[PDB]
């Protein structure tokens, strides 16, 4: 039941950088394990990934720079709630 989301305003999309959000009470130790799991699974298939940051305090998860090809596989990782493609924000 994990889902993928991306900005409806196409020119505001930032493909190649994804926010992997994990289930509500996921611990920082598990978010770090999941990001390493994504990296090992992607490496197996010949894909390079970079974990840019690991979140905790508000939402459990991590920021990853990777090919969108990996999203079917990333959605099947344990503890994943949803994945959202990065997008632009602007000064008002």
């Amino acid at each position: 039941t994990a889902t993928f989301h991306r900005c409806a305003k196409d020119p505001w999309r930032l493909p190649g950088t994804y926010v992997v959000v994990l289930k509500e009470e996921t611990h920082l130790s598990q978010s770090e394990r999941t990001a390493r799991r994504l990296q090992a699974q992607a490496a197996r298939r010949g894909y390079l990934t970079k974990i840019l940051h690991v979140f905790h305090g508000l939402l459990p998860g991590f920021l990853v720079k990777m090919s969108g090809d990996l999203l079917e596989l990333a959605l099947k990782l344990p503890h994943v709630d949803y994945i959202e493609e990065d997008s632009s924000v602007f000064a008002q």
């Binding site: 950088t17 959000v21 840019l52 508000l58 997008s87 632009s88 924000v89 602007f90 000064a91 008002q92």
Partner: protein
């Protein structure tokens, strides 16, 4: 005489209002040396910004700092600020062209929470004078921070559109602010203007707002937008929370509605179906 906006939010001037509250600004770089905000704004080590677009962009400090310096002055500026006693802390999430990312904004929201846990002070007010398209992750991070006891204020957006298609304007736990002018009418910005709809909580002055200019250390410039209106509400909320510190988020939202001017906006400016859905409230301070 005084700026029209400071007159408008005054019920028919407090020198150290909002002193118990700390305001976090998630915006462009700031001119911390500017005599209007000098000593009032603490520049955190936080920076998460995308690269500027273009062949060769010229990083000029005066232009890079413009949006943020003005907003910091509307909130707590020495001469033209709403809450002259409030403390501010700024994080850089917008680059010299006013652009940022959802991921940068989330890393910023997380940094605020980590700072609060390490060194708690009084009530926190988080100003987000930015907008993107609807974001499930940005609305979720905003909701989490509000549920953890932090007050969040965002601009409705300057797209003359429904604010529910914009984030963090669509997050319900956030106070979303649309902008009005000196005649109490919705602000028009070029061919666009203030956002509207069921996701907007109230309106506040957002046209020709005198604030700190980064063109010189003592300069003032007028600016317009829903970010300027949001800055008025972050200042008003800091004065209400400073005077009544035990206020919960819901209690604060009712104070803002109660002390607002009612039925002074001509609903005919918004599209026909949005008139019943748009709250006809213009923010004001209590006596």
């Amino acid at each position: 005489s005084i700026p029209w906006n400071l007159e408008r939010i005054t019920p028919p001037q407090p020198p150290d209002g909002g002193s118990l509250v700390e305001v976090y600004l998630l915006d462009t770089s700031i001119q911390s040396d500017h005599r209007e905000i000098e000593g009032r704004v603490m520049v955190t080590d936080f920076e998460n910004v995308p690269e500027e677009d273009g062949t060769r962009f010229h990083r000029q400090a005066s232009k890079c700092d413009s949006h943020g310096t003005h907003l910091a002055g509307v909130v707590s500026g020495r001469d033209a600020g709403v809450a002259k006693g409030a403390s501010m802390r700024s994080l850089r999430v917008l680059n010299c062209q006013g652009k940022g990312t959802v991921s940068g904004t989330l890393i910023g929201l997380e940094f605020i929470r980590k700072s609060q846990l390490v060194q708690p002070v009084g009530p926190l007010v988080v100003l987000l004078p930015l907008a993107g398209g609807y974001s499930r992750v940005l609305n979720a991070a905003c909701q989490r921070l509000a549920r953890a006891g932090v007050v969040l204020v965002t601009a409705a957006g300057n797209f003359r559109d429904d604010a529910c298609l914009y984030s963090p304007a669509s997050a319900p736990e956030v106070i979303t602010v649309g902008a009005t002018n000196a005649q109490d009418q919705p602000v028009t910005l070029g061919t666009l203007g203030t956002n509207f709809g069921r996701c907007v909580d109230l309106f506040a002055p957002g046209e020709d707002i005198i604030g700190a200019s980064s063109d010189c250390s003592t300069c003032f410039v007028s600016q317009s937008g829903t970010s300027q209106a949001a800055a008025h509400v972050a200042g008003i909320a800091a004065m209400m929370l400073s005077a009544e510190p035990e206020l919960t988020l819901a209690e604060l939202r009712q104070r803002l509605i109660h002390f607002s001017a009612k039925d002074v906006i001509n609903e005919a400016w918004f599209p026909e179906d949005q008139r019943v859905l748009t709250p006809n409230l213009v923010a004001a301070l209590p006596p």
